[PDB]
Amino acid sequence: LKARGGPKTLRRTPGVEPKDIRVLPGPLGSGNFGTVFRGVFKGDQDVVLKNAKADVMAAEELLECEMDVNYHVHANAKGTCARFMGCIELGAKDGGEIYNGTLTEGLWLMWANEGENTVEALMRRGTAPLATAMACADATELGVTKKAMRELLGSLARLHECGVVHRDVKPANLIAAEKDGGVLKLIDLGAAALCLPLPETLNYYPGDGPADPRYAKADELYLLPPGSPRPTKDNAAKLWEAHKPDRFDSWSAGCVMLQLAVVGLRTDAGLERFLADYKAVGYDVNAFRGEKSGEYGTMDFAALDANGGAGWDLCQRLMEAERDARASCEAALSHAFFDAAALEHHHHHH
């Protein structure tokens, strides 16, 4: 006899058909396991599209996890990240060619294009174009830091509240969303972990994972330390409290704050020099100021100095060496750094 065979099964999102998507050649970047492209949906909606790299082991499983975490975030933390528009899976005969503007065979994810800009690119162009894109009235390092950090820390707090650790917080993964008033949104949940069993943990394991070394403390490249049990449904809440994987995002948010606050730390080399000196004085911001800051004459720490050194203090909170001492992103939101000045805005108030 002969085997009968059968249909193919393809994953789809209601209302999203491959025929309605045009893909533009030119990766908006390859990351570790996937490739992002710009595209146009239904002729007039700017979107971003991601598929797996064919050459990377388990890239399909990593893209599936990114998909699952995006559905979780869409359900539980709307507005924290680029708006998720679902998936499109294309088969072999119906799969197209990027150069023809058509989606190729395999699984695709789609998001709204929240803006042409990243915070990395804007901050390097200058504080002025960054402030304009953020609709930030106080167009100073202090002003943009206060606004951006309040938005970033509030979004991280909402992600953490629903069990998600982003894992790749950095200026390149923020967009000032022009169509939502300039507010910052995160992109790229490709390394994110779902750390509570809601209903199962996702991408969450003991030991080192992918980490951008620029935005991760050199000896904490993990969410759960090697010593840790494997996460299961029964222990997840205990591990959360004991190992504080959310504090990985706190350290990265402190890096973002340093770069927003200090023009000279916006290059990779500037942040790298600062963090080496920070480590060398025992991750002690006051020791940095007392011992090292005098070496940084090309830079201007005014934003961190302002108001009794509030910004230095918040950086210290987000960047404590020990996770057990390091602020949660929710706690960090209450910091004096975010206070209104006495009588702020008096001169035009009713």
Question: Which residue numbers are catalytic?
Answer: 168
Residue 188 contacts which entry, a copy of itself, Mg ion, none (Cβ below 5-8 A, type-dependent): Mg ion
Largest CA distance in the chain: 89
Residue type, 107: L
Query: Which residue shows structure tokens 């998909």?
Result: 67
Instruction: Please spell the DSSP secondary structure of 184-249, one letter per residue.
Output: EEE---TT-EE-S-SSS-BS--BSB----GGGS-TT--BSB-TTSPPP-TTTHHHHHHHH-TTHHH
Q: How far is CA 70 from CA 102, 194, 277, in A?
A: 23, 10, 37
Segment 92 to 121, residues that bind Mg ion, using CB under 5 A: 106
Residues 268, 295, 322, 324: which binds Mg ion (CB under 5 A)?
A: 268
User: x/- binding map, residues 8-47, to Mg ion, per CB under 5 A?
Assistant: -----------------------x----------------
Q: Does the footprint of a copy of itself cover residue 294 (CB under 8 A)?
A: yes
Cα distances (angstroms) measured from residue 318 to each of 41, 122, 152, 311, 332: 40, 23, 13, 11, 7
101-160 residues in contact with a copy of itself (CB under 8 A) are 105
Tell me: does residue 268 bind a copy of itself (CB under 8 A). Answer: yes
- Burial of 30 by CB count in 10 Å (0-12 exposed, 13-18 middle, 19+ buried)? exposed
Dihedral sign of CA atoms 60, 65, 69, 74 in order: positive
Q: 27 or 126, CB closer to a copy of itself?
A: 27
The correct pick among 10, 25, 30, 238 for binding a copy of itself (CB under 8 A) is 30
**Start-to-end Cα distance in the chain:** 87
Q: 30 — alpha (psi -120 to 50), left (phi > 0) or beta?
A: beta
Tokens matching residue 154? 């509030």
- Per partner kind, with CB cut-offs from 5 to 8 A, the member of a copy of itself, Mg ion, none near residue 29 is a copy of itself
- The whole-angstrom separation of Cα 74 and Cα 79 is 8
Residue among 267, 290, 302, 325 that touches a copy of itself (CB under 8 A)? 267
Residues 32-71 interacting with a copy of itself (rule: CB under 8 A): 32, 54-59
Residue list 48-77, contact with Mg ion (CB under 5 A): 54
Tokens representing 39 are 């595209």
> Of residues 186-245, which lie at the interface with a copy of itself (CB under 8 A)?
208, 210-214, 216, 221
Binding mask 3-22 for a copy of itself (x = CB under 8 A): x-x-----------------
Among 172, 198, 281, 321, interactor with a copy of itself by CB under 8 A? 172
Stretch that binds a copy of itself, among 29-37, 134-142, 195-203, 306-314 (CB under 8 A): 29-37
Alpha carbon 277 to its chain centroid, in Å, reads 25
Of positions 66, 141, 188, 246, contacts Mg ion by CB under 5 A: 188
Is residue 270 at the binding interface for a copy of itself, with CB under 8 A as the rule? yes
Point out which span in 18-26, 41-49, 164-172, 293-301 binds Mg ion (CB under 5 A). 164-172
249 counts as binding Mg ion under rule CB under 5 A: no
Distances (CA, A) of 240 to 46, 94, 163: 38, 44, 9
Per CB under 8 A, residues contacting a copy of itself are 2-3, 5, 27, 29-32, 54-59, 92, 95, 105, 170, 172, 208, 210-214, 216, 221, 267-270, 294-295
